[model samples]
Target chain A: DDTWVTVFGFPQASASYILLQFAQYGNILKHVMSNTGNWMHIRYQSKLQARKALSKDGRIFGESIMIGVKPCIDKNVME
Target chain B: HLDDTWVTVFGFPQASASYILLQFAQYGNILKHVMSNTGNWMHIRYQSKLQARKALSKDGRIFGESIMIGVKPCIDKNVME
Candidate 1:
């Protein structure tokens, strides 16, 4: 019942900087970011759009950031 | 803002996801369409709440059968809260 789109293998960058990349796909509902990790969670308004973003797995961001989806579910500090 | 745009549907004569998708593809841009795994129900999400309402307007009338449609709740957990 949630549209939690997990963005993994992201770079250590500013929230605005990271999200601006994600903004291209769809309207994000809510998001969770941790300063200590290489991943962030975004909730999209559209599940289709979420999958759209999710499809970016293996794509590179800023020439170095490799985007990937979370492989499994687990408890998180930001959850 | 998004809670209002989600819709759940029920009573599809065909459990086929393709059939259900064909039927409701017109209400609006469906972000996600889920045919029930074990029941006669579905979860449909639209880009706009008004468009979701467009689907509901056909309630219990599509195919001259009882088609139950309703909007998703604001809260993800604890419905009736």
Candidate 2:
């Protein structure tokens, strides 16, 4: 099992990483298009299933991914 | 179905035009082009609000434009307007 750790603003990332390890999944980072503060986001998409492999089995992939609490740059700059 | 975390996309001066365009995009299932924010609960949508001319409005700002595409929805209608 390959283990990767990501210390994020949210505590759930630890569990997420563990789940991805067992599945031998890779991480996908998506840049948020809006100015809601969240910037870097992480997702896990699996090759085995039609559905995306995510952290929490109960939650959707989009919800289970890691999200930044605030924007990486100034809001006005993105505008 | 509704929440603050929901992101709504909008464009100023051309909100009406953008609004119609967004509608068409949504119809074509191409609204994804305008959406940047992602949510687990659901997809996102665009919304617009009209305001008076600048200098007359608060902060002396005439037009405000942005995109908020997410799962939640804005609670206040005035803010949207």
Candidate 3:
């Protein structure tokens, strides 16, 4: 299974920051900035990393503000 | 309106470029505003120096002192028409 994590609320975070933020979970296979506001698709090397991101909701990522991340159970609605 | 009608803005802890662009547009016509390739800073070009001045006057008020606005008065590659 592909390891994808959806992220939210980074209105000010840069694309590089977005990539670096989720990189801690594991090796990122891909990083997609969503068409919508503050949304991202982070595909990791393993499901474990995806789970790790899901467990990190309400945790501040790269930027010093509250952010949320969820496991991408469905790949269709990335945004 | 002129090459000198440019402003450099920063001091936002967490703001998207488009959001900041829209906020700056409230001041007046914007020729263009380009965000940094890697940082939070951006250069905004207003249609008129008067409007650019208006934006400067209205700066820091949008975020209510959380952000500070600075002027760049010189032309840059990013602000070129």
Candidate 4:
């Protein structure tokens, strides 16, 4: 399964920053920015690995953020 | 101390109380959950701030629906009702 997470709370944070932080737990499939630029969806190789990253409260650029980890079952994935 | 362990959840289906409890219980013992009888919000209290923080850290979608969670300001009297 292509496990994914939707992250928020970094209005000015960049995709490279997010990729760097989340890449530690698993291999990244891709990252998509939300239309409003307030959130982004990241796909990972393993759900467990994604969970591991989320298990620890995450921070980006020294600022704490929230992430929604869930299975990506739908064909119409977020862009 | 109570507020520290309390969290407010939004976007969770009101009928999914059992599912919410089950999902959150995996992280830690839940003290209680207060579903707003009149709103989409619900308040859940865990055994400690750590558990609450852990749960909030994964605050997004469940069951294909998006959800939001954040720390509650205080254990208000209305929440206890």
Measured by TM-score, the strongest candidate is 4
Q: List, residue by residue over A1-79, the lDDT tens digit for candidate 1.
A: 2456766544354346768888888897777774545456787787777777867654546634335553224356225
Model 3 misplaced stretches (Cα beyond 4 Å): A77-79, B1-81
Arrange candidates by DockQ, highest first: which order? Answer: 4, 2, 3, 1
CAPRI accuracy category, model 1: incorrect
Lowest summed lDDT window (length 10), candidate 3 chain B: B60-69
Q: TM-score of model 1 relative to the true fold?
A: 0.42
Q: Residue by residue across B19-65, what tens digits does model 1's lDDT show? A: 65667787789886655454445567788888888876754332423
Ranking by TM-score: 4, 3, 1, 2
In the range A13-74, model 2's lDDT, one tens digit per residue, is 33354344324435433222223321223332423321233232222233344222211233
Candidate 2 similarity to native, TM-score: 0.18
Local distance difference test values of all predictions, in order: 0.57, 0.27, 0.61, 0.57
Q: Give lDDT: candidate 1, residue B56.
A: 66
- lDDT over C-alpha atoms for residue B78 of model 4: 72
- Model 1 chain B: weakest 10-residue lDDT segment is B72-81
Q: In model 2, how many backbone clashes occur? A: 7
Which tens-of-lDDT digit does each residue in B1-81 have in candidate 4? 556777765434456546766776787888888766644456778888899887776555333333333333334557644
TM-scores, each model vs. reference: 0.42, 0.18, 0.44, 0.44
lDDT of 4 by residue, A1-79 (tens): 4467665434344445755776888888877765544355678788787677655432323332333334433356644
Indicate the residue-level lDDT of B17 in model 2.
36
The residue-by-residue lDDT of candidate 3 on A1-41, one tens digit each, is 44787665455346467567678779887777755344567
